[PDB]
Design a protein around this nucleic acid. Structure first.
Ligand SMILES: [K+]
Ligand SMILES: [Mg+2]
Ligand SMILES: [Mg+2]
Ligand SMILES: [Mg+2]
Ligand SMILES: [Mg+2]
Ligand SMILES: [Mg+2]
Ligand SMILES: [Mg+2]
Ligand SMILES: [Mg+2]
Ligand SMILES: [Mg+2]
Ligand SMILES: [Mg+2]
Ligand SMILES: [Mg+2]
Ligand SMILES: [Mg+2]
Ligand SMILES: [Mg+2]
Ligand SMILES: [Mg+2]
Ligand SMILES: [Mg+2]
Ligand SMILES: [Mg+2]
Ligand SMILES: [Mg+2]
Ligand SMILES: [Mg+2]
Ligand SMILES: [Mg+2]
Ligand SMILES: [Mg+2]
Ligand SMILES: [Mg+2]
Ligand SMILES: [Mg+2]
Ligand SMILES: [Mg+2]
Ligand SMILES: [Mg+2]
Ligand SMILES: [Mg+2]
Ligand SMILES: [Mg+2]
Ligand SMILES: [Mg+2]
Ligand SMILES: [Mg+2]
Ligand SMILES: [Mg+2]
Ligand SMILES: [Mg+2]
Ligand SMILES: [Mg+2]
Ligand SMILES: [Mg+2]
Ligand SMILES: [Mg+2]
Ligand SMILES: [Mg+2]
Ligand SMILES: [Mg+2]
Ligand SMILES: [Mg+2]
Ligand SMILES: [Mg+2]
Ligand SMILES: [Mg+2]
Ligand SMILES: [Mg+2]
Ligand SMILES: [Mg+2]
Ligand SMILES: [Mg+2]
Ligand SMILES: [Mg+2]
Ligand SMILES: [Mg+2]
Ligand SMILES: [Mg+2]
Ligand SMILES: [Mg+2]
Ligand SMILES: [Mg+2]
Ligand SMILES: [Mg+2]
Ligand SMILES: [Mg+2]
Ligand SMILES: [Mg+2]
Ligand SMILES: [Mg+2]
Ligand SMILES: [Mg+2]
Ligand SMILES: [Mg+2]
Ligand SMILES: [Mg+2]
Ligand SMILES: [Mg+2]
Ligand SMILES: [Mg+2]
Ligand SMILES: [Mg+2]
Ligand SMILES: [Mg+2]
Ligand SMILES: [Mg+2]
Ligand SMILES: [Mg+2]
Ligand SMILES: [Mg+2]
Ligand SMILES: [Mg+2]
Ligand SMILES: [Mg+2]
Ligand SMILES: [Mg+2]
Ligand SMILES: [Mg+2]
Ligand SMILES: [Mg+2]
Ligand SMILES: [Mg+2]
Ligand SMILES: [Mg+2]
Ligand SMILES: [Mg+2]
Ligand SMILES: [Mg+2]
Ligand SMILES: [Mg+2]
Ligand SMILES: [Mg+2]
Ligand SMILES: [Mg+2]
Ligand SMILES: [Mg+2]
Ligand SMILES: [Mg+2]
Ligand SMILES: [Mg+2]
Ligand SMILES: [Mg+2]
Ligand SMILES: [Mg+2]
Ligand SMILES: [Mg+2]
Ligand SMILES: [Mg+2]
Ligand SMILES: [Mg+2]
Ligand SMILES: [Mg+2]
Ligand SMILES: [Mg+2]
Ligand SMILES: [Mg+2]
Ligand SMILES: [Mg+2]
Ligand SMILES: [Mg+2]
Ligand SMILES: [Mg+2]
Ligand SMILES: [Mg+2]
Ligand SMILES: [Mg+2]
Ligand SMILES: [Mg+2]
Ligand SMILES: [Mg+2]
Ligand SMILES: [Mg+2]
Ligand SMILES: [Mg+2]
Ligand SMILES: [Mg+2]
Ligand SMILES: [Mg+2]
Ligand SMILES: [Mg+2]
Ligand SMILES: [Mg+2]
Ligand SMILES: [Mg+2]
Ligand SMILES: [Mg+2]
Ligand SMILES: [Mg+2]
Ligand SMILES: [Mg+2]
Ligand SMILES: [Mg+2]
Ligand SMILES: [Mg+2]
Ligand SMILES: [Mg+2]
Ligand SMILES: [Mg+2]
Ligand SMILES: [Mg+2]
Ligand SMILES: [Mg+2]
Ligand SMILES: [Mg+2]
Ligand SMILES: [Mg+2]
Ligand SMILES: [Mg+2]
Ligand SMILES: [Mg+2]
Ligand SMILES: [Mg+2]
Ligand SMILES: [Mg+2]
Ligand SMILES: [Mg+2]
Ligand SMILES: [Mg+2]
Ligand SMILES: [Mg+2]
Ligand SMILES: [Mg+2]
Ligand SMILES: [Mg+2]
Ligand SMILES: [Mg+2]
Ligand SMILES: [Mg+2]
Ligand SMILES: [Mg+2]
Ligand SMILES: [Mg+2]
Ligand SMILES: [Mg+2]
Ligand SMILES: [Mg+2]
Ligand SMILES: [Mg+2]
Ligand SMILES: [Mg+2]
Ligand SMILES: [Mg+2]
Ligand SMILES: [Mg+2]
Ligand SMILES: [Mg+2]
Ligand SMILES: [Mg+2]
Ligand SMILES: [Mg+2]
Ligand SMILES: [Mg+2]
Ligand SMILES: [Mg+2]
Ligand SMILES: [Mg+2]
Ligand SMILES: [Mg+2]
Ligand SMILES: [Mg+2]
Ligand SMILES: [Mg+2]
Ligand SMILES: [Mg+2]
Ligand SMILES: [Mg+2]
Ligand SMILES: [Mg+2]
Ligand SMILES: [Mg+2]
Ligand SMILES: [Mg+2]
Ligand SMILES: [Mg+2]
Ligand SMILES: [Mg+2]
Ligand SMILES: [Mg+2]
Ligand SMILES: [Mg+2]
Ligand SMILES: [Mg+2]
Ligand SMILES: [Mg+2]
Ligand SMILES: [Mg+2]
Ligand SMILES: [Mg+2]
Ligand SMILES: [Mg+2]
Ligand SMILES: [Mg+2]
Ligand SMILES: [Mg+2]
Ligand SMILES: [Mg+2]
Ligand SMILES: [Mg+2]
Ligand SMILES: [Mg+2]
Ligand SMILES: [Mg+2]
Ligand SMILES: [Mg+2]
Ligand SMILES: [Mg+2]
Ligand SMILES: [Mg+2]
Ligand SMILES: [Mg+2]
Ligand SMILES: [Mg+2]
Ligand SMILES: [Mg+2]
Ligand SMILES: [Mg+2]
Ligand SMILES: [Mg+2]
Ligand SMILES: [Mg+2]
Ligand SMILES: [Mg+2]
Ligand SMILES: [Mg+2]
Ligand SMILES: [Mg+2]
Ligand SMILES: [Mg+2]
Ligand SMILES: [Mg+2]
Ligand SMILES: [Mg+2]
Ligand SMILES: [Mg+2]
Ligand SMILES: [Mg+2]
Ligand SMILES: [Mg+2]
Ligand SMILES: [Mg+2]
Ligand SMILES: [Mg+2]
Ligand SMILES: [Mg+2]
Ligand SMILES: [Mg+2]
Ligand SMILES: [Mg+2]
Ligand SMILES: [Mg+2]
Ligand SMILES: [Mg+2]
Ligand SMILES: [Mg+2]
Ligand SMILES: [Mg+2]
Ligand SMILES: [Mg+2]
Ligand SMILES: [Mg+2]
Ligand SMILES: [Mg+2]
Ligand SMILES: [Mg+2]
Ligand SMILES: [Mg+2]
Ligand SMILES: [Mg+2]
Ligand SMILES: [Mg+2]
Ligand SMILES: [Mg+2]
Ligand SMILES: [Mg+2]
Ligand SMILES: [Mg+2]
Ligand SMILES: [Mg+2]
Ligand SMILES: [Mg+2]
Ligand SMILES: [Mg+2]
Ligand SMILES: [Mg+2]
Ligand SMILES: [Mg+2]
Ligand SMILES: [Mg+2]
Ligand SMILES: [Mg+2]
Ligand SMILES: [Mg+2]
Ligand SMILES: [Mg+2]
Ligand SMILES: [Mg+2]
Ligand SMILES: [Mg+2]
Ligand SMILES: [Mg+2]
Ligand SMILES: [Mg+2]
Ligand SMILES: [Mg+2]
Ligand SMILES: [Mg+2]
Ligand SMILES: [Mg+2]
Ligand SMILES: [Mg+2]
Ligand SMILES: [Mg+2]
Ligand SMILES: [Mg+2]
Ligand SMILES: [Mg+2]
Ligand SMILES: [Mg+2]
Ligand SMILES: [Mg+2]
Ligand SMILES: [Mg+2]
Ligand SMILES: [Mg+2]
Ligand SMILES: [Mg+2]
Ligand SMILES: [Mg+2]
Ligand SMILES: [Mg+2]
Ligand SMILES: [Mg+2]
Ligand SMILES: [Mg+2]
Ligand SMILES: [Mg+2]
Ligand SMILES: [Mg+2]
Ligand SMILES: [Mg+2]
Ligand SMILES: [Mg+2]
Ligand SMILES: [Mg+2]
Ligand SMILES: [Mg+2]
Ligand SMILES: [Mg+2]
Ligand SMILES: [Mg+2]
Ligand SMILES: [Mg+2]
Ligand SMILES: [Mg+2]
Ligand SMILES: [Mg+2]
Ligand SMILES: [Mg+2]
Ligand SMILES: [Mg+2]
Ligand SMILES: [Mg+2]
Ligand SMILES: [Mg+2]
Ligand SMILES: [Mg+2]
Ligand SMILES: [Mg+2]
Ligand SMILES: [Mg+2]
Ligand SMILES: [Mg+2]
Ligand SMILES: [Mg+2]
Ligand SMILES: [Mg+2]
Ligand SMILES: [Mg+2]
Ligand SMILES: [Mg+2]
Ligand SMILES: [Mg+2]
Ligand SMILES: [Mg+2]
Ligand SMILES: [Mg+2]
Ligand SMILES: [Mg+2]
Ligand SMILES: [Mg+2]
Ligand SMILES: [Mg+2]
Ligand SMILES: [Mg+2]
Ligand SMILES: [Mg+2]
Ligand SMILES: [Mg+2]
Ligand SMILES: [Mg+2]
Ligand SMILES: [Mg+2]
Ligand SMILES: [Mg+2]
Ligand SMILES: [Mg+2]
Ligand SMILES: [Mg+2]
Ligand SMILES: [Mg+2]
Ligand SMILES: [Mg+2]
Ligand SMILES: [Mg+2]
Ligand SMILES: [Mg+2]
Ligand SMILES: [Mg+2]
Ligand SMILES: [Mg+2]
Ligand SMILES: [Mg+2]
Ligand SMILES: [Mg+2]
Ligand SMILES: [Mg+2]
Ligand SMILES: [Mg+2]
Ligand SMILES: [Mg+2]
Ligand SMILES: [Mg+2]
Ligand SMILES: [Mg+2]
Ligand SMILES: [Mg+2]
Ligand SMILES: [Mg+2]
Ligand SMILES: [Mg+2]
Ligand SMILES: [Mg+2]
Ligand SMILES: [Mg+2]
Ligand SMILES: [Mg+2]
Ligand SMILES: [Mg+2]
Ligand SMILES: [Mg+2]
Ligand SMILES: [Mg+2]
Ligand SMILES: [Mg+2]
Ligand SMILES: [Mg+2]
Ligand SMILES: [Mg+2]
Ligand SMILES: [Mg+2]
Ligand SMILES: [Mg+2]
Ligand SMILES: [Mg+2]
Ligand SMILES: [Mg+2]
Lengths: 129, 121
RNA sequence: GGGAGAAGGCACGCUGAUAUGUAGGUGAGGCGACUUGCUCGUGGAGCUGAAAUCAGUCGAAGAUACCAGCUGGCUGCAACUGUUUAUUAAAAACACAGCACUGUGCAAACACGAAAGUGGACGUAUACGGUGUGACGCCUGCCCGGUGCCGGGAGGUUAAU
RNA sequence: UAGCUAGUAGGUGGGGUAACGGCUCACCUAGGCGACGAUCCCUAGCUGGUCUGAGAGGAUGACCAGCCACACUGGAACUGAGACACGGUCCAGACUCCUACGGGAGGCAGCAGUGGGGAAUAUUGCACAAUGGGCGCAAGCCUGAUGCAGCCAUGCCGCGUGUAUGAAGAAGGCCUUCGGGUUGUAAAGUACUUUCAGCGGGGAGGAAGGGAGUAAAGUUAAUACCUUUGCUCAUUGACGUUACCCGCAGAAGAAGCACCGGCUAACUCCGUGCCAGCAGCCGCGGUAAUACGGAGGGUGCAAGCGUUAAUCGGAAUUACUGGGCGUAAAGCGCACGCAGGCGGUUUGUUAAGUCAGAUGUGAAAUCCCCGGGCUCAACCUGGGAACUGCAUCUGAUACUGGCAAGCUUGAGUCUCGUAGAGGGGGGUAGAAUUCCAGGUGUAGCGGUGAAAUGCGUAGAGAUCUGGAGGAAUACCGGUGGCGAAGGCGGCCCCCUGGACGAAGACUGACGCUCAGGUGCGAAAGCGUGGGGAGCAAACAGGAUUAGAUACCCUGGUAGUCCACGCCGUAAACGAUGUCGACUUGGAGGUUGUGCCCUUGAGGCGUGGCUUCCGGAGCUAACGCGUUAAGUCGACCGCCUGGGGAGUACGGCCGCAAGGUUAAAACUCAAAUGAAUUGACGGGGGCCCGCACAAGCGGUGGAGCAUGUGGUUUAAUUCGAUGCAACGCG
RNA sequence: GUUCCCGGGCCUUGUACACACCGCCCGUCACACCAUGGGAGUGGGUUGCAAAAGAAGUAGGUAGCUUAACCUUCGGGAGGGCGCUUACCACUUUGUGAUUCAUGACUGGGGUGAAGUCGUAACAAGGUAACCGUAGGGGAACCUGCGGUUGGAUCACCUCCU
RNA sequence: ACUAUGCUCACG
């Protein structure tokens, strides 16, 4: 019962894009905001908030360029049934380095491109084509 | 499937059996021979096919096909056996080597003579 | 539950020591105390006393005599313990628990008896008598022409009167 | 193979060992091991590496190198620094030996070799010259360790077998469009070179030294002996008639063997006729074979070529990278649940995981780049990275875990209700069936496609009267409800489980899945004891039929009912595991609860559960489609071609019936799913024609004419043979 | 006159058919071969447990015999060496199991084989829809009961209503 | 109403 919250976030994005839906509400978290910020900062999501005190509801606002959605595909890599921790040199590059791999490293959550230059590896959370 | 299920019970590789139990990865094997005889094949063929029961040296009792027109095998006479199904006689799954030992060559062959064990003309 | 004492093994005498005879067993005078005693605890004086162990030691042999299972394998029949031809037959025969059929509504059927009357039973269909079968397990097929039995009552036949 | 273990597990007293210690005693404690697979069983030297693979992997452990083990089999210890000793000692064994018969030997899995085994692997070779090692002050012994070469197409690699010109486009073969093409610049030839073996002369390079007598410089009392660096000497080569460099002759000595229907580079003629044979897969042959045998012609490799066996590959056909489970193989029948896997949300702290750097180390070899020596390569070799390693201190703390204290959205509690064939136990009602006795009443009843068996003049059937008993509950009743599934329907009480709604309050992650385990689990069966109307396996009789151990009819026992135990399965089915999140719609059914005028069977929301149609999306398609087969996560179960087979064998479970677990040999090249076009149906609808009905005259009977079959014959020429051959050619 | 009979046409549906219902196809029975289970057993291989056995060796214990070096007072002491003995233990012997591999009269099924016998169970409403479980029956496919599934067909047949 | 069967192989 709702074991992985992060995978559930990435489905609401992926399914929200499939429906041509403007916004995507969900239960917030520390790590949810970290990922959603990395997605925003590169430019898959167009702005987000975290409206609420007691029961915080993080809502995203999905980007659309043409009729097509911006997120071509998005998938959980380090699921809880099988954690995937990669080394500095062994970090992946999604779509030959024109999509990103979100990776939780020891200096906060960041992109795979940022993790190479920062000089460290970590738990690869998701690929974002 | 399920990564936990596989940890608990790994992928069992399909141990495919050998077509030809002549044993110990042997290229060929000697046979004393008993009962040389003619047999009918399956449906679309219809013929009198030449075949002999081979008492192998290791202990096995098999049937080997006598390839070529005519043969010198009878009652006993020691012959050599190679691998290869005929695909017509159900049961027969070996070939006699023509040329080697008491199994002579086919009489008056010209084309393809390593098969069927004949020398130059 | 058995089979099973399956089979097959090994150890045993005597003498010291552990312990100048021990685990135990029975426990005297003694110490207090309760009530009033053929007292309670309390302690152990003797007395009795295995079984072990370790070492020695004699003989051909130590359960040394008497005493006191032969064992195993396949199989027929009868489940079993039991009973039987006193005196040539102990069995596979009889009985057996169990099984079914069947009769019997109690003044029961049935049995002994000219009868009265007893038993069945001071019981009452989860009871009683008869008959077959014979623990248990898996089962118990078809035939009602014959002979018996049960029921049916029209017609035919039919005694005494 | 699920339990194993008594020096077994510890502790101490003693004891031994190079040394820690049940290594070994004596006691003391009575444990230790095992689902993270003990024990037992089968198989096996291990690694560096090798092979294949894009890589992960899979396979593997010949050859070189490290480690272990073993030495005729089974013990044992001695001698030493080191062994329980490969050509040591000692017993015992088996099997060869020599014996004077008392007693003695013997150990190639060191090198050659024999027999034997086998599909199959080598000479009773040559030398210590080098390179190690053993010995020794060294002069050198011994070294089948190294070095070589015998043999071996067994490999990886090199050069061979000639090279220019050649028209009559010879012949002969070979196809013939008997005109000619083709083999064919092929040959014969006409010019030139001579690699390579085969003869012969030269002749590197593996060789550092060793040794003598020496000079000096050390050494010392010493210009002696000894030692060192200059220093003069003679020599050492198994391989060896070396490697190699020149001369002899003259194309001279030197090419197969697969294949040729498709896959897969490459065509014809004969011979043969489902025969003879090919076959890696499909498949080739029945008198015009591209597949068979031959020939030519080609094609592909060539000192090798095919076949064979063996591993990986392709095979995403065990899927970690990288598959599936509605219908193709595959969701346990359904629940509960311990171990296990996974787990909402927020701060603090450890750092186990994770990450970052650190030093160690991954033996050398191969493998990979920049080089170099073989005449070239193969080989050889120098360095480089590589050696994706594994450990060790230091930090980074996001994530995951550990430990905090929370929080409240998941999850649970209470509060008031709502619906319901949820369950279990007990009653009672009405209709009907059968039967029982009773009245009426007069020939049939019953049944069937049609009959008969059956039942009836003993008075049936029909009709009514009164009983008795059993089982099941018409109508309501629905694509209605409830239950985890199986399943659960008259009405009434008794006890009782859950579901849903309303708004609060409380708990504060208590959760989700679940291998083994355990419960429930239709019908049929099974056991003991009741009951027994109807129905009805078996069974009987009458029909049906070629037969009818069936279908139909008349009878009819177990059983169906009950109480209690067992069984443990079904197409136990939405052929769809459970939980959770997320993503267009419409029409309804059903049960809630709000807002409004109940102002009149309404107005408008919003929760459960449910049926039907459809969007995107998915799917092989059919279809599924907010109750997903969509998009994702957690965990479980299961699948790996068809037959053999959910069978055998063993285990467990059952009274049995049997269930459950669950193979292999062998055999086939398919089996399968969905959909497509036909054809067919004793499927449906609509039509048609001397198709049938409604007629009319015929053939079939006779004789004769004709034509076939047959039979006969010297010949009865030949052809036509359901309709569409038979007064037919 | 269109019900049936023979053929044909069109639409529709089911199909395991496709020289395309003169289709396909099931099981027994007969014959041949192959692998395979059971089987009175027989024969090897390995191995557990319970014992006996005790060679050499090593260690302990020593009445007996015996002796180079130490101490000796030149008596003999110590110490050894044989021999003996006790423990450990090899070959070997006995019993009884386990497991595994051969083999066995006969027997149960299974597979395979161009043209054998008996039927026609299934595929169409396959002519009684099929199949699943289960029980009984039957030469054979199978048939019948009870419950279950649709992976069944037709619904211009009635005659009257949606 | 009920109502069986079709010997083997052959369209690159
Ligand atoms: K039941
Ligand atoms: Mg790194
Ligand atoms: Mg050819
Ligand atoms: Mg005894
Ligand atoms: Mg006993
Ligand atoms: Mg004794
Ligand atoms: Mg004593
Ligand atoms: Mg005492
Ligand atoms: Mg004493
Ligand atoms: Mg004494
Ligand atoms: Mg005493
Ligand atoms: Mg004493
Ligand atoms: Mg005493
Ligand atoms: Mg005492
Ligand atoms: Mg005492
Ligand atoms: Mg005492
Ligand atoms: Mg007393
Ligand atoms: Mg007293
Ligand atoms: Mg005393
Ligand atoms: Mg005693
Ligand atoms: Mg003693
Ligand atoms: Mg003694
Ligand atoms: Mg004695
Ligand atoms: Mg005695
Ligand atoms: Mg006796
Ligand atoms: Mg016996
Ligand atoms: Mg007899
Ligand atoms: Mg008796
Ligand atoms: Mg008996
Ligand atoms: Mg008597
Ligand atoms: Mg008596
Ligand atoms: Mg008597
Ligand atoms: Mg008598
Ligand atoms: Mg008497
Ligand atoms: Mg008498
Ligand atoms: Mg007698
Ligand atoms: Mg007698
Ligand atoms: Mg007797
Ligand atoms: Mg008897
Ligand atoms: Mg008797
Ligand atoms: Mg009975
Ligand atoms: Mg009775
Ligand atoms: Mg009387
Ligand atoms: Mg009387
Ligand atoms: Mg009485
Ligand atoms: Mg009797
Ligand atoms: Mg039985
Ligand atoms: Mg009888
Ligand atoms: Mg009678
Ligand atoms: Mg009768
Ligand atoms: Mg009679
Ligand atoms: Mg009578
Ligand atoms: Mg009578
Ligand atoms: Mg009468
Ligand atoms: Mg009368
Ligand atoms: Mg009369
Ligand atoms: Mg009269
Ligand atoms: Mg204790
Ligand atoms: Mg490769
Ligand atoms: Mg691959
Ligand atoms: Mg490689
Ligand atoms: Mg070797
Ligand atoms: Mg090593
Ligand atoms: Mg050896
Ligand atoms: Mg030796
Ligand atoms: Mg030895
Ligand atoms: Mg050794
Ligand atoms: Mg040695
Ligand atoms: Mg030795
Ligand atoms: Mg000797
Ligand atoms: Mg010897
Ligand atoms: Mg030797
Ligand atoms: Mg040798
Ligand atoms: Mg040897
Ligand atoms: Mg030899
Ligand atoms: Mg030689
Ligand atoms: Mg020599
Ligand atoms: Mg010499
Ligand atoms: Mg010599
Ligand atoms: Mg020598
Ligand atoms: Mg020499
Ligand atoms: Mg040397
Ligand atoms: Mg040397
Ligand atoms: Mg020296
Ligand atoms: Mg000298
Ligand atoms: Mg020398
Ligand atoms: Mg020598
Ligand atoms: Mg030599
Ligand atoms: Mg040579
Ligand atoms: Mg090679
Ligand atoms: Mg090779
Ligand atoms: Mg030329
Ligand atoms: Mg040519
Ligand atoms: Mg030329
Ligand atoms: Mg020439
Ligand atoms: Mg020429
Ligand atoms: Mg040369
Ligand atoms: Mg020179
Ligand atoms: Mg030299
Ligand atoms: Mg030298
Ligand atoms: Mg010198
Ligand atoms: Mg020389
Ligand atoms: Mg020399
Ligand atoms: Mg040479
Ligand atoms: Mg020469
Ligand atoms: Mg030469
Ligand atoms: Mg010259
Ligand atoms: Mg010349
Ligand atoms: Mg071909
Ligand atoms: Mg082609
Ligand atoms: Mg081709
Ligand atoms: Mg021609
Ligand atoms: Mg060929
Ligand atoms: Mg032609
Ligand atoms: Mg031809
Ligand atoms: Mg050629
Ligand atoms: Mg080749
Ligand atoms: Mg192969
Ligand atoms: Mg493969
Ligand atoms: Mg693979
Ligand atoms: Mg996978
Ligand atoms: Mg698959
Ligand atoms: Mg199927
Ligand atoms: Mg399936
Ligand atoms: Mg299910
Ligand atoms: Mg179910
Ligand atoms: Mg848990
Ligand atoms: Mg968390
Ligand atoms: Mg924190
Ligand atoms: Mg702090
Ligand atoms: Mg810290
Ligand atoms: Mg380093
Ligand atoms: Mg270093
Ligand atoms: Mg290193
Ligand atoms: Mg290599
Ligand atoms: Mg090399
Ligand atoms: Mg190079
Ligand atoms: Mg050369
Ligand atoms: Mg190097
Ligand atoms: Mg190197
Ligand atoms: Mg280096
Ligand atoms: Mg460098
Ligand atoms: Mg370096
Ligand atoms: Mg290395
Ligand atoms: Mg720190
Ligand atoms: Mg901090
Ligand atoms: Mg955890
Ligand atoms: Mg914890
Ligand atoms: Mg709250
Ligand atoms: Mg709830
Ligand atoms: Mg209400
Ligand atoms: Mg209710
Ligand atoms: Mg209720
Ligand atoms: Mg109820
Ligand atoms: Mg109820
Ligand atoms: Mg009830
Ligand atoms: Mg009534
Ligand atoms: Mg009634
Ligand atoms: Mg009456
Ligand atoms: Mg009456
Ligand atoms: Mg009649
Ligand atoms: Mg009658
Ligand atoms: Mg009558
Ligand atoms: Mg009558
Ligand atoms: Mg009457
Ligand atoms: Mg009546
Ligand atoms: Mg009546
Ligand atoms: Mg009545
Ligand atoms: Mg009543
Ligand atoms: Mg419900
Ligand atoms: Mg459900
Ligand atoms: Mg009650
Ligand atoms: Mg519930
Ligand atoms: Mg509750
Ligand atoms: Mg609420
Ligand atoms: Mg808390
Ligand atoms: Mg609170
Ligand atoms: Mg479960
Ligand atoms: Mg389970
Ligand atoms: Mg149960
Ligand atoms: Mg039940
Ligand atoms: Mg039950
Ligand atoms: Mg039942
Ligand atoms: Mg019953
Ligand atoms: Mg019974
Ligand atoms: Mg009874
Ligand atoms: Mg009855
Ligand atoms: Mg009936
Ligand atoms: Mg009937
Ligand atoms: Mg019957
Ligand atoms: Mg009758
Ligand atoms: Mg009948
Ligand atoms: Mg009949
Ligand atoms: Mg009836
Ligand atoms: Mg009932
Ligand atoms: Mg009841
Ligand atoms: Mg009850
Ligand atoms: Mg049960
Ligand atoms: Mg179950
Ligand atoms: Mg099942
Ligand atoms: Mg069902
Ligand atoms: Mg259903
Ligand atoms: Mg549905
Ligand atoms: Mg299922
Ligand atoms: Mg559950
Ligand atoms: Mg709710
Ligand atoms: Mg669609
Ligand atoms: Mg999909
Ligand atoms: Mg579609
Ligand atoms: Mg669905
Ligand atoms: Mg939704
Ligand atoms: Mg929604
Ligand atoms: Mg919903
Ligand atoms: Mg759902
Ligand atoms: Mg789904
Ligand atoms: Mg699917
Ligand atoms: Mg499989
Ligand atoms: Mg298979
Ligand atoms: Mg198979
Ligand atoms: Mg079974
Ligand atoms: Mg058992
Ligand atoms: Mg049982
Ligand atoms: Mg039974
Ligand atoms: Mg299974
Ligand atoms: Mg076949
Ligand atoms: Mg299928
Ligand atoms: Mg289909
Ligand atoms: Mg039709
Ligand atoms: Mg039709
Ligand atoms: Mg007309
Ligand atoms: Mg007419
Ligand atoms: Mg007329
Ligand atoms: Mg007429
Ligand atoms: Mg006629
Ligand atoms: Mg006529
Ligand atoms: Mg006529
Ligand atoms: Mg005339
Ligand atoms: Mg004629
Ligand atoms: Mg004639
Ligand atoms: Mg004619
Ligand atoms: Mg003709
Ligand atoms: Mg003709
Ligand atoms: Mg015609
Ligand atoms: Mg028609
Ligand atoms: Mg038309
Ligand atoms: Mg249809
Ligand atoms: Mg169908
Ligand atoms: Mg259908
Ligand atoms: Mg179909
Ligand atoms: Mg055909
Ligand atoms: Mg037919
Ligand atoms: Mg068949
Ligand atoms: Mg069969
Ligand atoms: Mg002993
Ligand atoms: Mg001894
Ligand atoms: Mg000693
Ligand atoms: Mg000694
Ligand atoms: Mg003396
Ligand atoms: Mg002397
Ligand atoms: Mg003196
Ligand atoms: Mg003395
Ligand atoms: Mg002395
Ligand atoms: Mg022994
Ligand atoms: Mg032995
Ligand atoms: Mg076996
Ligand atoms: Mg056998
Ligand atoms: Mg056997
Ligand atoms: Mg025989
Ligand atoms: Mg036949
Ligand atoms: Mg046949
Ligand atoms: Mg049928
Ligand atoms: Mg049929
Ligand atoms: Mg029929
Ligand atoms: Mg039917
Ligand atoms: Mg049918
Ligand atoms: Mg059907
Ligand atoms: Mg059955
Ligand atoms: Mg029965
Ligand atoms: Mg039968
Ligand atoms: Mg018959
Ligand atoms: Mg029947
Ligand atoms: Mg039936
Ligand atoms: Mg019947
Ligand atoms: Mg349907
Ligand atoms: Mg009609
Ligand atoms: Mg027939
Ligand atoms: Mg046919
Ligand atoms: Mg046919």
């Amino acid at each position: 019962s709702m074991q992985d919250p992060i995978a559930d976030m990435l489905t609401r994005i992926r399914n929200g894009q499939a429906a041509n839906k403007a916004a995507v509400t969900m239960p917030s978290s520390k790590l949810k905001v970290a990922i959603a910020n990395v997605l925003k900062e590169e430019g898959f999501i167009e702005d987000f908030k975290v409206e609420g005190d007691t029961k915080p509801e993080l809502e995203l606002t999905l980007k659309y360029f043409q009729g097509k959605a911006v997120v071509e595909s998005i998938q959980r890599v380090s699921r809880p049934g099988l954690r995937i921790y990669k080394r500095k040199d062994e970090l992946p590059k999604v779509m030959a380095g024109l999509g990103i791999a979100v990776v939780s490293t020891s200096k906060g959550v960041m992109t795979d491109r940022a993790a190479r230059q920062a000089g460290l590896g970590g738990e690869i959370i998701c690929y974002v084509a | 499937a399920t990564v936990n299920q596989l940890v608990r019970k790994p992928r069992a590789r399909k141990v495919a059996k050998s077509n030809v139990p002549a044993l110990e990865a042997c290229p060929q094997k000697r046979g004393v021979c008993t009962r040389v005889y003619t047999t009918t094949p399956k449906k679309p063929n219809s013929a009198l096919r030449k075949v002999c029961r081979v008492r192998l040296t290791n202990g096995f009792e098999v049937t080997s096909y006598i390839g070529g027109e005519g043969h010198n095998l009878q009652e006993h006479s020691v012959i050599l056996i190679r691998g290869g199904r005929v695909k017509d006689l159900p049961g027969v799954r070996y070939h006699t080597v023509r040329g080697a030992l008491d199994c002579s060559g086919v009489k008056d062959r010209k084309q393809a003579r390593s098969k069927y064990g004949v020398k130059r003309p």
